[PDB]
Amino acid sequence: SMQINLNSTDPVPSKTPFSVSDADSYNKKGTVTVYDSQGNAHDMNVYFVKTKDNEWAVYTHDSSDPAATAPTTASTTLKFNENGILESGGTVNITTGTINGATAATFSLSFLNSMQQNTGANNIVATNQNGYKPGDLVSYQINNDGTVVGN
Amino acid sequence: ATAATFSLSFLNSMQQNTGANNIVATNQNGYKPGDLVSYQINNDGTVVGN
């Protein structure tokens, strides 16, 4: 997941096309690190490009895979209503690249709770993922309801 | 002296997605005696030498 506050007053970038290497071809970049089943980290870059009023194209790219094709088509488009609430495009399946001969990760990316503010600066408030590479028992505890938990 | 011939097992070895190569355990059924140090009677009456 990635929760972003986007600025309704932002410009549509004049520099085309979108390119991960041209910093004035997009409005905002964020990152979320995901894992494959081998446990390799993939640093997934997420780019937001305002296309017109209330719509933002979203590109993704596995920055950790040198063989990955540069993103020329959007993974999704976020559409916000008049109140700046996310109305569509908020959920999209992403497939990573591959690292050191290991199979890619495939995950649902959610933009839930993202909003378009009347005025502000583009800003990522939160990211989250259910991926990780173990891992060793550090402590354990008995809670006051008797639940036993490992940390 | 004559060589030992043994089955070597890598049971429970794993390839982690990420970590450092690390041996967690080794074990063998070989040893050179050896002298009685203590003996005991357990609470089920089993008698064991140490």
UniProtKB/Swiss-Prot annotation, chain A:
This is Flagellar hook protein FlgE. Belongs to the flagella basal body rod proteins family. It is found in: Bacterial flagellum basal body. It comes from Salmonella typhimurium (strain LT2 / SGSC1412 / ATCC 700720). Transmembrane segments: none annotated.
